[PDB]
Amino acid sequence: MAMKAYSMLNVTATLDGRRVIGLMDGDDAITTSPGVDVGTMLVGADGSWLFSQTADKSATVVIKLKPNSPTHRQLTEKWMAQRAGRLVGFPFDFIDSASNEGGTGAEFFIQKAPDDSKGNNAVVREWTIVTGEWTPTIPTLL
Amino acid sequence: MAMKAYSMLNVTATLDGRRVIGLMDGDDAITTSPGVDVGTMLVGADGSWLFSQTADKSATVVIKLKPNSPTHRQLTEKWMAQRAGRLVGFPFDFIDSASNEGGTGAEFFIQKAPDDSKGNNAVVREWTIVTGEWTPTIPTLL
Amino acid sequence: MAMKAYSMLNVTATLDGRRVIGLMDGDDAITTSPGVDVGTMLVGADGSWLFSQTADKSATVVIKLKPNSPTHRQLTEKWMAQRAGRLVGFPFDFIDSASNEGGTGAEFFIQKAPDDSKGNNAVVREWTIVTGEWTPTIPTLL
Amino acid sequence: MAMKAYSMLNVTATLDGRRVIGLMDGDDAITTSPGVDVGTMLVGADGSWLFSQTADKSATVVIKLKPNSPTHRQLTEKWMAQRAGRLVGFPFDFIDSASNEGGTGAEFFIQKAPDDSKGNNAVVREWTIVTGEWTPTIPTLL
Amino acid sequence: MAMKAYSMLNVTATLDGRRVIGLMDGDDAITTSPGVDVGTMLVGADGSWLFSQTADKSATVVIKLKPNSPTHRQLTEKWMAQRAGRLVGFPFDFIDSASNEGGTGAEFFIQKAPDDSKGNNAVVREWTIVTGEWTPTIPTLL
Amino acid sequence: KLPYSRVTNVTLTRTDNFPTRRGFGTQLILTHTAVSGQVDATKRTKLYASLAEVEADYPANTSVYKAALSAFSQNPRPIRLKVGYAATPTGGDDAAKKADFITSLGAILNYDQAFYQITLDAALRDQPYLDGLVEWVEAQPKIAMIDSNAAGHEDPANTTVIAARHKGTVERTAVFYHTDSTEYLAASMAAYMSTRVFDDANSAYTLKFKKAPGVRAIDKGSAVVTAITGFVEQTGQSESAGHCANTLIDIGDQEFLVEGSTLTQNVFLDEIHATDWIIARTEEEMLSLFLNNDRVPFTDQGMQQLASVPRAIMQLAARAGIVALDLNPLTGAYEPAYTITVPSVFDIPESQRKARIAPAIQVRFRYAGAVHYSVINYTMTF
Amino acid sequence: RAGIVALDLNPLTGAYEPAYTITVPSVFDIPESQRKARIAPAIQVRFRYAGAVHYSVINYTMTF
Amino acid sequence: AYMSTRVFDDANSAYTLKFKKAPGVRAIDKGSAVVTAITGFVEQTGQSESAGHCANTLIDIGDQ
Helix, strand or coil: CCCCCCCHHHEEEEECCEECCCCCCCCCCEEEEECCCCEEEEECCCCCEEEEECCCCCEEEEEEECCCCHHHHHHHHHHHHHHHCCCCCCCEEEEECCCCEEEECCCEEECCCCCCCCCCCCCCEEEEEEECCCEEECCCCC | CCCCCEEHHHEEEEECCEECCCCCCCCCCEEEEECCCCEEEEECCCCCEEEEECCCCCEEEEEEECCCCHHHHHHHHHHHHHHHCCCCCCCEEEEECCCCEEEECCCEEECCCCCEECCCCCCCEEEEEEECCCEEECCCCC | CCCCCEEHHHEEEEECCEECCCCCCCCCCEEEEECCCCEEEEECCCCCEEEEECCCCCEEEEEEECCCCHHHHHHHHHHHHHHHCCCCCCCEEEEECCCCEEEECCCEEECCCCCEECCCCCCCEEEEEEECCCEEECCCCC | CCCCCCCHHHEEEEECCEECCCCCCCCCCEEEEECCCCEEEEECCCCCEEEEECCCCCEEEEEEECCCCHHHHHHHHHHHHHHHCCCCCCCEEEEECCCCEEEECCCEEECCCCCCCCCCCCCCEEEEEEECCCEEECCCCC | CCCCCCCHHHEEEEECCEECCCCCCCCCCEEEEECCCCEEEEECCCCCEEEEECCCCCEEEEEEECCCCHHHHHHHHHHHHHHHCCCCCCCEEEEECCCCEEEECCCEEECCCCCEECCCCCCCEEEEEEECCCEEECCCCC | CCCHHHCCCECCECCCCCCCCCCCCCEEECCCCCCCCCCCCCCCCECCCCCCCCCCCCCCCCCCHHHHHHHCCCCCCCCCCEECCCCCCCCCCCCCCCHHHHHHHHCCCCCCCCCCEEEECCCCCCCHHHHHHHHHHCCCCCEEEECCCCCHHHCCCCCCCHHHHCCCCCCCEEECCCCCCCCCHHHHCCCCCCCCCCCCCCCCCCCCCCCCCCCCCCCCCCCCCCCECCCCCCCCCCCCCCECCCCCCECCCCECCCCCCEEECCEEHHHHHHHHHHHHHHHHHHHHHHCCCCCCCCCHHHHHHHHHHHHHHHHHHHHHCCECCCECCCCCCECCCCCEECCCHHHCCHHHHCCCCCCCCEECCCECCCCCCCCCCCCCCC | CCCCECCCECCCCCCECCCCCEECCCHHHCCHHHHCCCCCCCCEECCCECCCCCCCCECCECCC | CCCCCCCCCCCCCCCCCCCCCCCCCCCCCCCCCCCCCECCCCCCCCCCCCCCECCCCCCCCCCC
């Protein structure tokens, strides 16, 4: 079980049961960022210090898809479902098999929508999703 | 004991006992910056001047790690420990053997967290840590 | 006494007695900038004008040093001396021998501190000092 | 044990156990080049100097093979194995028996692939392999 | 003491005590080039001019050796010594006895490394060394 | 249970330790006292590591301990002090003749030649036979200095004194005059003289003229510090109007060495030290050249190979600050600081080619000055 | 790479010295009589053990 | 149990000591100057073969 080379052929992402397939080119196709800073250091006028830790365990994820990808169809159906009035979680979770690095969430929600650009060639479609809780998994294989 | 050429093979960093190994490429992989300015000069409407010196001896450090580095595992365990509720110091200290330049701190805290980007190749993971006190060591070998 | 070509081998800088030796590469290694603007013109709604001249004769200087320079050791000792509580002037003065252009000050103070970046190669260390008075010397040899 | 004349009949190369046989004509059939420069000299604006030494001990090797060579079959199997998802080292090592000049590596990886040109005659097939560590052997017989 | 004809049998080069013997064929086997330009002329928009002289007295040297030369063994030992962590000067100096033209340096460092090409015949091995100071000797016999 | 000492060992003592600070040369302390357990005529020279290792000599004897304490007291500390045995005979059977003393010295080199500085103390003070040392330290690559405790140096007219009979004639010795009970040579020599590294940039201590000792007090006098140190107030330093020595005067509360350890009218100690370093470096590099290469042929090819060593030592020395900066002081015009001339072997006959001894290489210097005095004018116009 | 072999530095001086060397006998001279056994001559390898730490010493001199 | 479960092909995975390691589930023995006869370990200078038998005992120093 040697720590093999990194490859996109071992990263798996699941969005409400079905997989994510059509991804745009680039070094950043699925990016997750935390909500706020972990903490804040406050230093007074005398030199003492006090650290404050937040309770906000939330994250956002950005997915970049080609204009022709079944995940795009699934997401554009979910967006219309939200617009109609129905509101549900559709859990999303992704992981790398080489080092067990990644995370999972229980209830996400569509936060942004892509811009439909036609032009002369294909263009990215970016979706931004937001969770209320986000649990990373500890990479046990280093 | 001639002042030898600089090399990354003589810089040692220790984070809560264990060493730091997996570092990303670049001219800046471990960077420490002070909290606030050392002082402030105030010049009045007549031409006199008064200098004011702060008591804030605090610093922040930024570490850039590969997605596959044992230090990444250690830090992502410490982050979860903080999120659970436990709060401790985990001293960090680093130094260069060629000129004894560097510094040490007694109690740090995780302040930021990296963004998990998968994409097509490997991407940096940046951690930002903050101390309440930071003591540099005077470079005695010039 | 012809106005010879400019060269860094004729510029002399003195910081509290000792010289400055280790300087980074670039067209700007020692730069002095005045505190505020010399004056201000105010033109009213009718077309008349009034000029106002300030009494703020103060300046700041920025010095860029290699990570291995005795001036870096001297400055990092002076910084710790200030942090301890001692506060003194350490006059700084610099001049060009080809045209007697430059200036001097009587009491400076460390205002900024560099960032300790290790990385793969050598990086600059920038120090910013501030005076309450700054007297330029008139270039008499043109 | 006189230092005999150079000859390709005394150079031995081993790629994952089996030998390399089919090599194209030319003065350069197996060429190994280091990753980056050994060091870098930085000279400041005053005339002082500082040398920086890298920790990157990595190399790449280029092998040129005829269109009909068993090594070509082995390499084109290894390439498909990598494409499937399996990732392993397949150590490569080569040496000259006349002067013990050459080197070895522990874990290589296929980095480039040849272009299948048919045309009217035979054409070269160039493979480029990359290691993370490369240990040369010191030529002891001069 | 007539200015005799030039010959490679009167040029002597010394690299850390021992001589350099195995050199490749060609009109350029040992070439030394200065670091940067001696100066720079700046002409303004009015027609006046100002010349600026640098303080960078540094040089690089390129040596071309056969694959079977004791100097190659010495250099490939020094390279491994640098890679291990030891950093020293190994002065290099060369001169022509017919006109006392050449130069010397006090502390050099290996900057580049050759490419191990086997092929069908012998190929050059080029080493590039860099100094922080380089003193040429004035050719006194014209 | 079990103590923590099974895996570690942490002490807590009260002493004063100083940094290592390797240097150029080591000094020798020679006197008559012997311990007979290590120094009895079988090891006329003995090494050490620190004051702790000093056990054989008495911890209160006047010669060794009362000088070694000062020697090991510099803010950066020297290492490996050397202890001598030379004048174990009390000068001689007839002390009027120094012939026994020179022979005593001649028998201490053979055991070991590693020291560079000679300091005799607590004895041999102004003794008539001691003059032999002045005769012996010349034609020798070493430095020997004598700290007289009291004499008629205050009168610039006498001649019976050490620095009076020998004044401007000797170029390798100096007199660290003080009052009694102060061991002074050890304070600066090989305590500050040793701990200097000449291979670094700008590390040329040309003055030695403004330096503080480890622990010692000042002397007294204002116009009597001219008879001693032979220094004119303004014009310069006159050899006739005083004896050239050193006294460690103070001007503020700051006590420091004065006159810069001269040996003759204007021959300062650092100029000797730097040239000795250059010589002792070229010798070592030449030695490290016959041992690496197998053979050095007897032609121009091998001649330039030997010339390669000084051509690098001079380059490494001009960086330190011992050699002038390629400018003729007379005009400020161009003039090479150092030139190396190599004889041509093309003409040397076979008869002298069979000796396997090369002809001589010549090198030219240009000493880099310093500053000991300043003048300002301050013309006020009102 | 694992950390079993020393890092190319002689402990006596800290000067350069190879950590491991591999020596291969030359078959050019081995007679046919012993060449018919189909048993190769012996290859030799040199190590340099990489140490560890089991005990520590600190001094803690206090000046006041 | 700990000897087996080490992989030497990875970087920095050389457990040269085996000298500071915890077992699965077991308790300590007792003694202070009797852990010198066993384990034959000198307090400071080193490990003397004459002044003890070289063995192992799984001692504790803290609660560890």
